[PDB]
Amino acid sequence: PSVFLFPPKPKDTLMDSRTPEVTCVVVDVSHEDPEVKFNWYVDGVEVHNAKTKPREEQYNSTYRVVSVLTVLHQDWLNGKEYKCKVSNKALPAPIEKTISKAKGQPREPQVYTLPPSREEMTKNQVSLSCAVKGFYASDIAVEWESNGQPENNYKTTPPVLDSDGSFFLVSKLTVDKSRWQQGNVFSCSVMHEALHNHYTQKSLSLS
Amino acid sequence: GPSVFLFPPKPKDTLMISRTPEVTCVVVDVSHEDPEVKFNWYVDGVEVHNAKTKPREEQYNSTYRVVSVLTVLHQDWLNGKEYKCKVSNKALPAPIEKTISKAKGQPREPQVYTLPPSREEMTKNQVSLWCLVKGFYASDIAVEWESNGQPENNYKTTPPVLDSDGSFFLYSKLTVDKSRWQQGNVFSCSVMHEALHNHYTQKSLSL
């Protein structure tokens, strides 16, 4: 059996109303030795506000035991390291993994909206684009709105490392050509730690 | 004991008759005690015998790495033939088999749209030209940029992203000096995919 450690979701660390969690996942737990132990440490000191989630049975007769430790938003953003220690009979030793936020000076996203190409104006649905570039580190959230309400027919590329060490991505919202032609306003909402209030939004409409 | 990794041709290799597409079978962690390794190759389950196997190469961790390379016919790959590499070791409990092929499904033609810079970005010294490529299947694809027939190499392309209709999309961002955009030099996005006629299309962008 092997251990895998996962950071919080980007949006979770950026809004106080959300609950960021580090999650320790362990797999290949044979039914013969299905009892697993966890121990969590934050910046070298042990912590006890963690929990454990109910297990499952994978298709290969191996259990998948998990444990989520709730973290302070500011703890994670300030760089603290999260060590998860895993002990079991079938493992010769206690496995450990330490994870933290990427190191370095945060850099603010620049957000640019791009209207659909005229060539796409022959289709019944058109593509609205939100370029987000120059940000560091790569944790970011992007979503779309119209008239203050969610526009969910969108997909966003992962962050891509640019030649200057910052990241970019593009979000693509697909809407009915009719909606774009009447002049409705669409908005691209970006959250990132380096933005004021962790949030910014840019609009896009037919001129 | 040993592990086997099986690698496909690069996207452009199967798309141009000048290039040579290859499937590469790599065996690592071969021991000194049992160093002998045998490859068997199969196409749609029929054994083939034209592969080129290199002699074992000792690595700095005192294991051997052994490589066998199978030339494939472009149209065999594009027609979905399955390529199986079988690796035999006297230490191995049974031979290790790996198979690779093109991703399954009906190919779908990429639509290619160029997008000019946002007016907001027009206040910077450098500027971003966008090549949207969407609706393609499968996700093996190549994108590059040129101006006046010469490579424009200062670009980055997102990985393909699975869209909600089952096809893929990606963006390629070419960054150029804003001056070049404003004298009106023409930039071109070139795309290769099995579902394009002649496996190639090109879209231009200019002020």
Ligand SMILES: *[C@@H]1O[C@H](CO[C@@H]2O[C@@H](C)[C@@H](O)[C@@H](O)[C@@H]2O)[C@@H](O[C@@H]2O[C@H](CO)[C@@H](O[C@@H]3O[C@H](CO[C@H]4O[C@H](CO)[C@@H](O)[C@H](O)[C@@H]4O[C@@H]4O[C@H](CO)[C@@H](O)[C@H](O)[C@H]4NC(C)=O)[C@@H](O)[C@H](O[C@H]4O[C@H](CO)[C@@H](O)[C@H](O)[C@@H]4O[C@@H]4O[C@H](CO)[C@@H](O)[C@H](O)[C@H]4NC(C)=O)[C@@H]3O)[C@H](O)[C@H]2NC(C)=O)[C@H](O)[C@H]1NC(C)=O
């Ligand atoms: C002893 O050393 C050797 C050699 O290492 C060399 O020497 C030592 C001393 C050091 O100096 C090294 O730095 C030095 O490189 C070690 O051999 C290595 O063994 C590891 C683990 O066994 C292999 O890892 C795999 O790597 C492949 C990808 O490998 C390509 O990219 C590497 C760069 O990222 C590159 O180094 C490789 O050479 C190879 O490069 C490609 O080569 C092809 C063919 O020539 C070429 O056409 C390409 O252009 C070229 N590409 C590039 C970018 O250069 C990786 O894909 C593997 O991941 C799969 O397997 C993992 C399980 O091991 C799993 O976690 C992954 O998720 C993934 O799993 C696969 O997932 C897919 C779908 O996602 C699924 O379909 C598959 O079935 C599944 N496979 C599974 C589960 O097995 C993997 O990470 C190294 O390639 C190999 N190095 C070399 C040079 O061969 C050896 O480990 C050392 N031994 C000890 C005991 O220490």
Ligand SMILES: *[C@@H]1O[C@H](CO)[C@@H](O[C@@H]2O[C@H](CO)[C@@H](O[C@@H]3O[C@H](CO[C@H]4O[C@H](CO)[C@@H](O)[C@H](O)[C@@H]4O[C@@H]4O[C@H](CO)[C@@H](O)[C@H](O)[C@H]4NC(C)=O)[C@@H](O)[C@H](O[C@H]4O[C@H](CO)[C@@H](O)[C@H](O)[C@@H]4O[C@@H]4O[C@H](CO)[C@@H](O)[C@H](O)[C@H]4NC(C)=O)[C@@H]3O)[C@H](O)[C@H]2NC(C)=O)[C@H](O)[C@H]1NC(C)=O
């Ligand atoms: C039985 O069947 C089981 C179920 O199919 C199977 O379990 C699987 O086990 C494999 C390993 O054997 C494990 O694979 C790892 O996956 C890591 C990422 O997992 C993500 O994403 C995958 C899908 O992409 C999901 O399946 C996972 O559940 C997990 O999802 C995340 O879950 C958390 C939980 O809260 C969420 O918060 C996340 O949002 C969510 N994300 C996503 C996208 O879903 C992957 O990182 C691992 O790769 C690394 O380790 C490998 C060693 O095995 C290396 O080969 C590889 O190169 C990676 O190395 C790391 O690379 C880093 C970046 O470059 C470096 O910085 C590190 O240094 C380096 N570390 C190491 C140690 O190498 C790995 O592939 C699956 O996740 C797991 N599935 C599940 C559901 O748990 C069993 O294996 C099966 N057993 C048998 C015997 O058949």
